[PDB]
PDB file of all heavy atoms in Angstrom:
ATOM      1  N   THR A   1     -11.454 -12.324   9.297  1.00  0.00           N
ATOM      2  CA  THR A   1     -11.204 -12.429  10.728  1.00  0.00           C
ATOM      3  C   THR A   1     -12.142 -11.433  11.423  1.00  0.00           C
ATOM      4  O   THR A   1     -11.806 -10.241  11.472  1.00  0.00           O
ATOM      5  CB  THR A   1      -9.710 -12.115  10.988  1.00  0.00           C
ATOM      6  OG1 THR A   1      -9.398 -10.876  10.337  1.00  0.00           O
ATOM      7  CG2 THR A   1      -8.773 -13.206  10.435  1.00  0.00           C
ATOM      8  N   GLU A   2     -13.300 -11.881  11.958  1.00  0.00           N
ATOM      9  CA  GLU A   2     -14.208 -10.911  12.578  1.00  0.00           C
ATOM     10  C   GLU A   2     -15.136 -11.453  13.712  1.00  0.00           C
ATOM     11  O   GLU A   2     -15.295 -10.760  14.722  1.00  0.00           O
ATOM     12  CB  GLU A   2     -15.037 -10.233  11.462  1.00  0.00           C
ATOM     13  CG  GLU A   2     -14.508  -8.843  11.133  1.00  0.00           C
ATOM     14  CD  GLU A   2     -14.323  -8.590   9.636  1.00  0.00           C
ATOM     15  OE1 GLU A   2     -13.635  -9.397   8.962  1.00  0.00           O
ATOM     16  OE2 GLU A   2     -14.851  -7.561   9.145  1.00  0.00           O
ATOM     17  N   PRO A   3     -15.773 -12.634  13.627  1.00  0.00           N
ATOM     18  CA  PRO A   3     -16.624 -13.056  14.763  1.00  0.00           C
ATOM     19  C   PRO A   3     -15.846 -13.137  16.106  1.00  0.00           C
ATOM     20  O   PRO A   3     -16.424 -12.945  17.188  1.00  0.00           O
ATOM     21  CB  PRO A   3     -17.217 -14.382  14.274  1.00  0.00           C
ATOM     22  CG  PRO A   3     -17.245 -14.206  12.783  1.00  0.00           C
ATOM     23  CD  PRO A   3     -15.912 -13.574  12.503  1.00  0.00           C
ATOM     24  N   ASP A   4     -14.531 -13.432  16.009  1.00  0.00           N
ATOM     25  CA  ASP A   4     -13.599 -13.511  17.142  1.00  0.00           C
ATOM     26  C   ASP A   4     -13.717 -12.267  18.052  1.00  0.00           C
ATOM     27  O   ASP A   4     -13.304 -12.315  19.209  1.00  0.00           O
ATOM     28  CB  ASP A   4     -12.157 -13.630  16.622  1.00  0.00           C
ATOM     29  CG  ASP A   4     -11.773 -12.552  15.621  1.00  0.00           C
ATOM     30  OD1 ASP A   4     -12.617 -11.694  15.319  1.00  0.00           O
ATOM     31  OD2 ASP A   4     -10.629 -12.569  15.140  1.00  0.00           O
ATOM     32  N   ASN A   5     -14.245 -11.148  17.515  1.00  0.00           N
ATOM     33  CA  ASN A   5     -14.482  -9.945  18.310  1.00  0.00           C
ATOM     34  C   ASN A   5     -15.979  -9.795  18.494  1.00  0.00           C
ATOM     35  O   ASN A   5     -16.420  -9.403  19.573  1.00  0.00           O
ATOM     36  CB  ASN A   5     -13.890  -8.676  17.658  1.00  0.00           C
ATOM     37  CG  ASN A   5     -14.457  -8.348  16.300  1.00  0.00           C
ATOM     38  OD1 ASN A   5     -15.457  -7.629  16.189  1.00  0.00           O
ATOM     39  ND2 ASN A   5     -13.865  -8.821  15.215  1.00  0.00           N
ATOM     40  N   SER A   6     -16.769 -10.122  17.445  1.00  0.00           N
ATOM     41  CA  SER A   6     -18.238 -10.034  17.515  1.00  0.00           C
ATOM     42  C   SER A   6     -18.776 -10.606  18.825  1.00  0.00           C
ATOM     43  O   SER A   6     -19.854 -10.217  19.272  1.00  0.00           O
ATOM     44  CB  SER A   6     -18.874 -10.807  16.366  1.00  0.00           C
ATOM     45  OG  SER A   6     -18.280 -10.472  15.124  1.00  0.00           O
ATOM     46  N   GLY A   7     -18.012 -11.542  19.419  1.00  0.00           N
ATOM     47  CA  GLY A   7     -18.381 -12.177  20.679  1.00  0.00           C
ATOM     48  C   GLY A   7     -19.134 -11.330  21.679  1.00  0.00           C
ATOM     49  O   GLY A   7     -20.122 -11.785  22.256  1.00  0.00           O
ATOM     50  N   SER A   8     -18.666 -10.099  21.906  1.00  0.00           N
ATOM     51  CA  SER A   8     -19.358  -9.213  22.838  1.00  0.00           C
ATOM     52  C   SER A   8     -20.498  -8.497  22.115  1.00  0.00           C
ATOM     53  O   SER A   8     -20.259  -7.855  21.092  1.00  0.00           O
ATOM     54  CB  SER A   8     -18.404  -8.168  23.415  1.00  0.00           C
ATOM     55  OG  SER A   8     -17.224  -8.747  23.946  1.00  0.00           O
ATOM     56  N   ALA A   9     -21.732  -8.609  22.632  1.00  0.00           N
ATOM     57  CA  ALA A   9     -22.874  -7.922  22.027  1.00  0.00           C
ATOM     58  C   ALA A   9     -22.618  -6.415  22.090  1.00  0.00           C
ATOM     59  O   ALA A   9     -23.085  -5.650  21.247  1.00  0.00           O
ATOM     60  CB  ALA A   9     -24.152  -8.271  22.781  1.00  0.00           C
ATOM     61  N   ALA A  10     -21.851  -6.012  23.110  1.00  0.00           N
ATOM     62  CA  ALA A  10     -21.438  -4.639  23.378  1.00  0.00           C
ATOM     63  C   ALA A  10     -20.104  -4.712  24.135  1.00  0.00           C
ATOM     64  O   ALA A  10     -19.686  -5.813  24.498  1.00  0.00           O
ATOM     65  CB  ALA A  10     -22.487  -3.932  24.222  1.00  0.00           C
ATOM     66  N   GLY A  11     -19.433  -3.585  24.376  1.00  0.00           N
ATOM     67  CA  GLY A  11     -18.168  -3.631  25.099  1.00  0.00           C
ATOM     68  C   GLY A  11     -17.143  -2.747  24.425  1.00  0.00           C
ATOM     69  O   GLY A  11     -17.453  -2.054  23.472  1.00  0.00           O
ATOM     70  N   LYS A  12     -15.931  -2.760  24.914  1.00  0.00           N
ATOM     71  CA  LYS A  12     -14.884  -1.934  24.327  1.00  0.00           C
ATOM     72  C   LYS A  12     -14.239  -2.649  23.115  1.00  0.00           C
ATOM     73  O   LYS A  12     -14.167  -3.891  23.103  1.00  0.00           O
ATOM     74  CB  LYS A  12     -13.840  -1.639  25.412  1.00  0.00           C
ATOM     75  CG  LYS A  12     -14.459  -0.930  26.633  1.00  0.00           C
ATOM     76  CD  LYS A  12     -15.149   0.405  26.244  1.00  0.00           C
ATOM     77  CE  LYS A  12     -15.939   0.994  27.416  1.00  0.00           C
ATOM     78  NZ  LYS A  12     -16.077   2.469  27.259  1.00  0.00           N
ATOM     79  N   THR A  13     -13.805  -1.874  22.099  1.00  0.00           N
ATOM     80  CA  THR A  13     -13.149  -2.399  20.909  1.00  0.00           C
ATOM     81  C   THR A  13     -11.780  -1.748  20.708  1.00  0.00           C
ATOM     82  O   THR A  13     -11.659  -0.532  20.790  1.00  0.00           O
ATOM     83  CB  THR A  13     -13.987  -2.137  19.696  1.00  0.00           C
ATOM     84  OG1 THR A  13     -15.215  -2.853  19.874  1.00  0.00           O
ATOM     85  CG2 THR A  13     -13.300  -2.598  18.392  1.00  0.00           C
ATOM     86  N   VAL A  14     -10.752  -2.553  20.452  1.00  0.00           N
ATOM     87  CA  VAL A  14      -9.395  -2.026  20.249  1.00  0.00           C
ATOM     88  C   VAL A  14      -8.901  -2.595  18.915  1.00  0.00           C
ATOM     89  O   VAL A  14      -9.214  -3.734  18.579  1.00  0.00           O
ATOM     90  CB  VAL A  14      -8.473  -2.510  21.392  1.00  0.00           C
ATOM     91  CG1 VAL A  14      -7.028  -2.166  21.108  1.00  0.00           C
ATOM     92  CG2 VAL A  14      -8.885  -1.865  22.718  1.00  0.00           C
ATOM     93  N   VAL A  15      -8.144  -1.810  18.175  1.00  0.00           N
ATOM     94  CA  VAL A  15      -7.524  -2.305  16.960  1.00  0.00           C
ATOM     95  C   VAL A  15      -6.065  -2.411  17.327  1.00  0.00           C
ATOM     96  O   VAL A  15      -5.466  -1.475  17.867  1.00  0.00           O
ATOM     97  CB  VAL A  15      -7.753  -1.403  15.763  1.00  0.00           C
ATOM     98  CG1 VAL A  15      -6.828  -1.807  14.583  1.00  0.00           C
ATOM     99  CG2 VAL A  15      -9.220  -1.463  15.310  1.00  0.00           C
ATOM    100  N   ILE A  16      -5.457  -3.613  17.073  1.00  0.00           N
ATOM    101  CA  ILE A  16      -4.044  -3.842  17.343  1.00  0.00           C
ATOM    102  C   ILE A  16      -3.351  -3.943  15.957  1.00  0.00           C
ATOM    103  O   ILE A  16      -3.805  -4.698  15.108  1.00  0.00           O
ATOM    104  CB  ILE A  16      -3.871  -5.178  18.119  1.00  0.00           C
ATOM    105  CG1 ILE A  16      -4.527  -5.073  19.554  1.00  0.00           C
ATOM    106  CG2 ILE A  16      -2.405  -5.514  18.248  1.00  0.00           C
ATOM    107  CD1 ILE A  16      -3.799  -3.952  20.408  1.00  0.00           C
ATOM    108  N   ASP A  17      -2.258  -3.191  15.770  1.00  0.00           N
ATOM    109  CA  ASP A  17      -1.568  -3.186  14.474  1.00  0.00           C
ATOM    110  C   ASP A  17      -0.088  -3.551  14.596  1.00  0.00           C
ATOM    111  O   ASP A  17       0.747  -2.735  15.001  1.00  0.00           O
ATOM    112  CB  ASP A  17      -1.734  -1.743  13.879  1.00  0.00           C
ATOM    113  CG  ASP A  17      -0.917  -1.520  12.610  1.00  0.00           C
ATOM    114  OD1 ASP A  17      -0.982  -2.379  11.715  1.00  0.00           O
ATOM    115  OD2 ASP A  17      -0.197  -0.466  12.532  1.00  0.00           O
ATOM    116  N   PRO A  18       0.288  -4.782  14.282  1.00  0.00           N
ATOM    117  CA  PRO A  18       1.703  -5.250  14.321  1.00  0.00           C
ATOM    118  C   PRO A  18       2.417  -4.560  13.119  1.00  0.00           C
ATOM    119  O   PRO A  18       2.027  -4.839  11.983  1.00  0.00           O
ATOM    120  CB  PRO A  18       1.590  -6.769  14.165  1.00  0.00           C
ATOM    121  CG  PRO A  18       0.109  -7.096  14.130  1.00  0.00           C
ATOM    122  CD  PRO A  18      -0.639  -5.841  13.835  1.00  0.00           C
ATOM    123  N   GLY A  19       3.418  -3.715  13.348  1.00  0.00           N
ATOM    124  CA  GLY A  19       4.003  -2.946  12.248  1.00  0.00           C
ATOM    125  C   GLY A  19       4.693  -3.819  11.219  1.00  0.00           C
ATOM    126  O   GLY A  19       5.160  -4.912  11.549  1.00  0.00           O
ATOM    127  N   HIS A  20       4.727  -3.301   9.977  1.00  0.00           N
ATOM    128  CA  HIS A  20       5.424  -3.940   8.851  1.00  0.00           C
ATOM    129  C   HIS A  20       4.824  -5.284   8.546  1.00  0.00           C
ATOM    130  O   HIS A  20       3.682  -5.536   8.937  1.00  0.00           O
ATOM    131  CB  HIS A  20       6.906  -4.066   9.236  1.00  0.00           C
ATOM    132  CG  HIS A  20       7.491  -2.748   9.644  1.00  0.00           C
ATOM    133  ND1 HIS A  20       7.696  -1.710   8.766  1.00  0.00           N
ATOM    134  CD2 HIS A  20       7.845  -2.284  10.889  1.00  0.00           C
ATOM    135  CE1 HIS A  20       8.152  -0.669   9.481  1.00  0.00           C
ATOM    136  NE2 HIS A  20       8.271  -0.931  10.786  1.00  0.00           N
ATOM    137  N   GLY A  21       5.556  -6.131   7.802  1.00  0.00           N
ATOM    138  CA  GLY A  21       5.045  -7.452   7.418  1.00  0.00           C
ATOM    139  C   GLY A  21       5.264  -7.709   5.916  1.00  0.00           C
ATOM    140  O   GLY A  21       5.310  -6.764   5.118  1.00  0.00           O
ATOM    141  N   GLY A  22       5.371  -8.967   5.553  1.00  0.00           N
ATOM    142  CA  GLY A  22       5.507  -9.357   4.136  1.00  0.00           C
ATOM    143  C   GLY A  22       6.746  -8.763   3.480  1.00  0.00           C
ATOM    144  O   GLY A  22       7.867  -8.954   3.970  1.00  0.00           O
ATOM    145  N   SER A  23       6.551  -8.014   2.400  1.00  0.00           N
ATOM    146  CA  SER A  23       7.666  -7.373   1.671  1.00  0.00           C
ATOM    147  C   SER A  23       8.467  -6.375   2.537  1.00  0.00           C
ATOM    148  O   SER A  23       9.629  -6.059   2.204  1.00  0.00           O
ATOM    149  CB  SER A  23       7.126  -6.595   0.475  1.00  0.00           C
ATOM    150  OG  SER A  23       6.301  -7.420  -0.330  1.00  0.00           O
ATOM    151  N   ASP A  24       7.843  -5.836   3.637  1.00  0.00           N
ATOM    152  CA  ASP A  24       8.557  -4.881   4.502  1.00  0.00           C
ATOM    153  C   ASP A  24       8.962  -5.543   5.803  1.00  0.00           C
ATOM    154  O   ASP A  24       8.102  -5.801   6.657  1.00  0.00           O
ATOM    155  CB  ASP A  24       7.631  -3.647   4.781  1.00  0.00           C
ATOM    156  CG  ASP A  24       8.333  -2.543   5.590  1.00  0.00           C
ATOM    157  OD1 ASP A  24       9.555  -2.672   5.867  1.00  0.00           O
ATOM    158  OD2 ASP A  24       7.675  -1.568   5.947  1.00  0.00           O
TER     159      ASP A  24
END
């Protein structure tokens, strides 16, 4: 999962982290 952000040649970048998942 990466070109979906590559879209901007430049610009601001944020990492979003949905807590837990799967076994937790």
